[PDB]
Amino acid sequence: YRHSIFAVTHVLIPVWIIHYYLKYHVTAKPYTVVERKPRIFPGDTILETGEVIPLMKEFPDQHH
Amino acid sequence: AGGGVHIEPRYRQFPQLTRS
Amino acid sequence: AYLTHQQKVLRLYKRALRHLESWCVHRDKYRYFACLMRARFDEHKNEKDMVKATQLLRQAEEEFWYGQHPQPYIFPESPGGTSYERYECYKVPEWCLDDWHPSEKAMYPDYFAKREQWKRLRRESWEREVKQLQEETPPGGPRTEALPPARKEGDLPPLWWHIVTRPRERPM
Amino acid sequence: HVTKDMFPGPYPKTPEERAAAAKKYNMRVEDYEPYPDDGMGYGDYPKLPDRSQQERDPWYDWDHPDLRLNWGEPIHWDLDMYIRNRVDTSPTPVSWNTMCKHLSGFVAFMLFMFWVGEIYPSYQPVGPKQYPYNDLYLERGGDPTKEPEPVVHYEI
Amino acid sequence: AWRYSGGFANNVSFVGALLKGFKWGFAAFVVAVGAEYYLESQN
Amino acid sequence: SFPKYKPSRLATLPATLDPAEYDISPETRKAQAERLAIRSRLKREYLLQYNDPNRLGVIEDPALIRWTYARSANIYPNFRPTPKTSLLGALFGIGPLFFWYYVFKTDRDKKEKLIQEGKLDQTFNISY
Amino acid sequence: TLCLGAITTLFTALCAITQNDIKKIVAFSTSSQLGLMMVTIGINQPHLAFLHICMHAFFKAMLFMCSGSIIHSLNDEQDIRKMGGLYKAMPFTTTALIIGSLALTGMPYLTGFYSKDLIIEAVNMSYTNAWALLMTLIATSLTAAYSTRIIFFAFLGKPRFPPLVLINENNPLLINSIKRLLIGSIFAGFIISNNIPPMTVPNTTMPLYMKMTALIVTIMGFMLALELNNTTYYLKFKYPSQTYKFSNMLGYYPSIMHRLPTYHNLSMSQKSASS
Amino acid sequence: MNPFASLTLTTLIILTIPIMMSNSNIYKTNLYPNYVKTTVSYAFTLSLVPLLMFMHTGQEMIISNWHWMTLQTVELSLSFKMDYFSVMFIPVALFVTWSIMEFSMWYMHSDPFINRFFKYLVLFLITMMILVTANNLFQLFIGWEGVGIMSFLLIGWWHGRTDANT
Amino acid sequence: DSWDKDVYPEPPRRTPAPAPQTSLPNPVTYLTKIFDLLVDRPVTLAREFIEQQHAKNRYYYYHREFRRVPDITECEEKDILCMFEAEMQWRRDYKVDQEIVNIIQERLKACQQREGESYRQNCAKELEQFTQVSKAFQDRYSDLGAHYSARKCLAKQKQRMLAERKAAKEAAA
Amino acid sequence: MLKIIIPTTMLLPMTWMSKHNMIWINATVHSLLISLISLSLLNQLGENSLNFSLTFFSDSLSAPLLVLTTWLLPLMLMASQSHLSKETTTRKKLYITMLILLQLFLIMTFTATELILFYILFEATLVPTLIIITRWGNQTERLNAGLYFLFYTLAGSLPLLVALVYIQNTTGSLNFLIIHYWSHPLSNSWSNIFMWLACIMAFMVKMPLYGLHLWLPKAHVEAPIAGSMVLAAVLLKLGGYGMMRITTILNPLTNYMAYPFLMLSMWGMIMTSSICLRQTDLKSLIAYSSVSHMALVIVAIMIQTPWSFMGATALMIAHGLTSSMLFCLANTNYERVHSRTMILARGLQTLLPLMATWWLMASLTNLALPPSINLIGELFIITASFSWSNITIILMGMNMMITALYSLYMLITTQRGKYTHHINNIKASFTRENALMALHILPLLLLTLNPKMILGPLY
Amino acid sequence: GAHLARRYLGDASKEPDPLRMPTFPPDYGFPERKEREMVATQQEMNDAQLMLQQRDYCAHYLIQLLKCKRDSFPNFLACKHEQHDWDYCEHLDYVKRMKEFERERRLLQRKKRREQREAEMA
């Protein structure tokens, strides 16, 4: 119980108010949560367009 | 105040250790 | 005041061993060179020429200063030690208890009652002890700071309150 | 409380007033001396030997153990400089000039060969970092409209 | 005398402090390596 | 032997190996004895007031008030205009002020000399 | 920053070996470390420097409360002259101290290895200042040097503490706190280095005799430091070497900085300025 | 816009809770050190989650929260930079601070002002995450002296000692 | 959203498709799911609760539109009334201009972090956008002093035409 | 403004006719109430200042400073009922009479719509102050201090009076608005230079000035505590407020004939800060500390830069609140030890825990660490000075050194260390002292949330 | 390295300074020196969020370490041969780096000896 009430008071309540602050106040203004562009690589389908970027051309294939 | 700790000091001799 | 010649030799010998302990570190070597250090002390003891002694003290401590450890060993609770008055923060003067609120004072009934006994006893004995002080002043003012002991019976040593009621070295 | 008759005043000119000035600072005539009468305004305040508070013997009991002054003893004109927290003049084990010689030597010793170290820098028997697309001119902020100077490496 | 006698004597050499637990260490080596050797042999 | 310790104002000579205390004369004997005497007078009288159970004030220290008075007030009435004070006041006074004037003017004149024909780059400097 | 980094590594380590307080020696070892990453900062290696912070954080913090464990138990004494024989008397702290010491030396396949040796390997394999390389190499050897001094004087020696011995670490708060940093230090770098994405270019083509020097230099730093430290066992005439007289007194730096300019500015305020 | 925004910032505000509760003076003035440590322990476990988030993909983010100032063309605003440097150093800083907090309960288990000491440690801890997580140079300044001044009181913990003040 | 997407341009968001190569479960997907039903859902539910409570009575607000003013250059000399009307006109022009460059400056910062380490070549248009605005600001408001006034701004502008046209006509020959 | 000026006057008949022992209580509560009313002026439009009438007008500079005065009046009244309750009622009532009159002149001065109207009451603040130092002071040198203060500011006020009426005879009315809109570029003729000196020396002699700072150690240290706040918190801003108000008809002569004053202030603050590092009196250390910060303000105005003024207003009000609080700190000891020597009463943290804390964040706020508006004040000036000249930071930052050493040195010497053995008078801190000091620092921290109000007219 | 000894303590005129070279033309002494190749266009390397200092020729072997590592999450020990594959080509082009360093050095010695030989010959 002591560990549970401490978990709710100091994690559940703080994370809720931060998320509410972030979701509808901080992110409401533009460019306040701006993140790095999601890194993608050849041979990966981009989610919102479904386009598979063509595989990078053949490797020289030299190992040890 | 009250002592009775798990250890006890020694005088110029090897102090007691524990298995852990 | 007057530091006699044999006294300084004692102080120099004490500081020499402390410095020699710092240099030797190990106990068996510490006992080794201290005995050698002792051996080179007792043989210059039966000199009738005091000029030799003070001259001997000259280059001897000149040797002491050259050979002193740049980082000598001091116990922590001594001047320069790592625990020099590190407990002075916690200690509080006894007279500050007079400012305590009566609710706080009543929360320590018996001890504060005993404090009253100390206060009344000091108040009564103050007149007796100051009278003794003025009654045996050396002519021409106090010659030395040393306090005279309580002479008669049923009295207290003059100028005793602060030394007796000084805060403990382990206040917490 | 304190009266105007005992207070700092003028420079001690005559020895008789020097004796009074000595008692003024509760000290004796033979040891009492004033600051040099340089017109700096020191007056009759004595210039005691320049010993910081650390020089005082700690084992001896002081009325002010934190700073080691007894009651009524005329403190130094510049106590704030020589207080325990502030500037100190305790005797170091080795002489001050030797302290300066080795210290000033070390920094110059350290600095000088670092210059000749730059004179003969340490590197590897290796070539430079090759880079494609005209050593990344386009990606290093170069203007695409400006024609990139053709740079391209070969094998060996 | 007590500083050099009693249980406080028989001080381990300097290297033995670094090699503390080497006996059980190398003991755990063979079992782990042998386990890998058979697992790689199965592979 | 070996090298000794040469002193300085900041690194004082230790008052233990100083030759003065090692050689002793009868004149010095009562000289230090009277040091204890005057110190004892100061200490005992202070302790007497200190241990007084009715003294509920502050034991005034004459050395403190004299020090403050000499360091603060009793200086100008004892100041006398003499050469060394005169040049010291001029040196540590107008000295740095005019010296700072030269370099700052030197910076200023060189700075505005650069921009009047366009020898500076502040294309993004707008919140001056 | 190569200039500042190189000198910082030497002087802090140079004063480190000739000290006596456990806290002083450990701290000097830190200031030697903070000399390291800025050396790496200069030659286009920021991320390795930042990674060096992570690995240094684990064992360097650890070395303190392990020394704190010794200090409090043996009646708050910090002079290395007053311990010895704590190997078999303080098992967990002795293990924790030597683990931190080995990690602090970049010894292979540990917390230090995944940072320090890559740093020493990278610093030589670049166009740098020559005088900086000699200093970093010497500092690493001196880095191990005072580490042996700590283990030699504090643990591997005859006991020297006051008679009534109260040494004990059985308090669970002490055991669990050190243990967490122990199991952290053993792996730490292995997890982090294998996990973080490649962010620099690890050089590969490179001759053997500066590949091994990351560990060669500390082998002697262990070796002759042990020889010189155990020389105190032999009953020998005591003589203060001038270089020791320089190093032991913090390289004379406080006795000039903390006395000469401080006196002048304060005196300038009294003689000039105020008066 | 995944929980990466909330999780990192919650770690900072969670660290402030022991300080805010201490300001009441009706707080846990008996077992304060244990309360402080378990708070850091919670934030340590929580602060792991942003790590593996960056570890999995590499989502570095900028959190430009409440706008403070509009100095002409300069807009000073509280902004946390969740770079790789900040995102992983916070777990490490929390890990060591948790480790010593347990040791602090052991070493200075007899200090009469131990509760005040643990309050100072969080204050120093707070100033550090401000220093690590700081976009604008002003925030970097905020953590800089904030760490710097907090070192003064903690060093002068035994203010009775003359040398400690020096 | 609460802002136009043109005056706050946003390149299309390109996110990778999760490709699990290691059969062992990854954690990062689970704790996001745990967070979703433990934190995000109550926050959205609370957000919905006061959103419909907000919609109970939503009063309006607008922005005070200011009529165009004859500025300083056509203001009568020593005419305090027209000058006051015109001085405020230029004073308001300063603050909207300050927000003009604030948007461009902030857009400049948004590009740098969004593009990661590729910022140097991606934020090339953004760089010249700031260059076209920042340079104009120096020759529009900079070096006007603490007690800036449109007359001083007009005086500086007249200095610009006189200086540049004199060089232009002499160079043209 | 009539909503403030009339109520401020109305306390005077009330206090003079209140009951015997209700004087402090009644006066304080309405004095706090007036400050609440004065909070109304914080609103300022993005354009021309709030011009209530030809008689009075307030801008984004006067309003933050005005509220400081109104918020101050409870603080001297609540700081003075301990060292005056032993005097008769009439003299105590007369003390309130001076303080209320002192405020009324300040309120009218900061809001004057006419330059010459500013001049009268801005100078007229001398009479209520001069009474305070000379009558209720607690030392012998207070009389020479009163002459030092009165004559030193009057020596500059008169040339300003001749200068102001001359501008009247040459340009008509000196209304602040019409002056700003009707501006004529000042020529480099010798007469204009002397006119420049007259319009400037009156204000520049008033903050401190290096060379003209000799009255602060005489006045502030010897003044009564209720007064001592005012000579450092608000009237120093009168010499400030004049500067930004008058430096609009002197451009561009202030561009050139400012190096001697800029040079005196930049090097001067390093000197006077170094005085603090080696001072003996607690109050004198505080007063000399106020010299260094105020000299920083003097530097700030003379570049005429938007950033310079922007941090100038913040620095003044931030410094004024702090210097008052530190002068409260000197008073707290002064009642118990009955002396002002610093080393007399070392070791107060052990005896007074909370008073040590009150001395703590007061010292940090004087330390000007971020985000306290002392930092936002100094830091803004640094950039403005740096843009003016890059070498400034060498002189700029070196002040940050000294202001760091002496600030903690005053803290360390008094609070930390072993308690004085021979003292037995230090009692628990009165709730009046602690509550007063909280009312100093708390709004100062509360202002940190939105320093947009305190930034000034340039913002 | 022996190069520093041969330069500072030896004939520095015959030692190629790292900043100076490449000086001689690529095909000087090389009949048909073949240009280097770049399999990965700058579009994907830019797309791959790769550091410019890492944006070298061998970066083409680097762009799939991050891809597989992301796919291998949380298993951080999956890509071992693939990581080895990249650092091998690092070695190869690194190997190329001092051979061309020595190539210009040998050209420097060859030219210097030739000039001295013809100087006394003529």
Write structural notes for this entry.
Chain K: It comes from Sus scrofa (Pig). Chain K: InterPro entries: NDUB7 (IPR008698). The structure is cut from a larger assembly and holds 11 protein chains of 10 kinds. Chain D has 156 residues and is mostly helical. Chain D is 28% helix and 0% strand. The radius of gyration of chain D is 34 Å and the shape is elongated. In chain D, 33% of the residues are buried. By secondary structure, chain G is mainly alpha-helical. Chain G is 68% helix and 1% strand. Chain G has helices at residues 2-17, 22-42, 46-73, 86-89, 91-104, 113-124, 130-154, 172-187, 189-195, 213-230, 242-248, 253-257, 260-274; one strand spanning 164-165. In chain G, helix 2 (22-42) runs antiparallel to helix 3 (46-73). Chain G is globular, with a radius of gyration of 21 Å. In chain J, helix 4 packs antiparallel against helix 6 (126-136). Chain D binds chain F through residues 1-2, 6-11, 24-28, 30, 38-43, 45, 50-51, 55, 63, 69-75, 77, 79, 89-99, and chain F through 3-15, 31, 34, 38-39, 42-43, 45-46, 50, 59-67, 69-71, 74-76, 78-82, 84-85.
Count the E strands of chain F. Answer: 0
Radius of gyration of chain F: 30 Å
Number of helices of chain K: 4
Number of helices of chain F: 5
Order of helices and strands of chain F: HHHHH
What percentage of amino acids of chain F are in beta strands?
A: under 5%
End-to-end distance of chain F, in Å? 69 Å
Mass-distribution shape of chain K: elongated
Give the strand content of chain K.
under 5%
- Which chains share the greatest interface? D-F, 45 and 44 residues
Rg over CA atoms of chain K: 21 Å
Shape of chain F: elongated
Structural class category of chain F: mainly alpha
Q: What pattern of helices and strands is seen along the backbone of chain K?
A: HHHH
Helix content of chain F: 55-70%
Compute the separation of the termini of chain K in Å.
Answer: 38 Å
The structure class of chain K reads mainly alpha
Largest sheet of chain F: none
Helix content of chain K: 40-55%
- What is the number of beta strands of chain K? 0
Largest sheet of chain K: none
Catalytic activity (chain J): a ubiquinone + NADH + 5 H(+)(in) = a ubiquinol + NAD(+) + 4 H(+)(out)
Subcellular location (chain J): Mitochondrion inner membrane
Subunit structure (chain J): Core subunit of respiratory chain NADH dehydrogenase (Complex I) which is composed of 45 different subunits.
EC number (chain J): 7.1.1.2
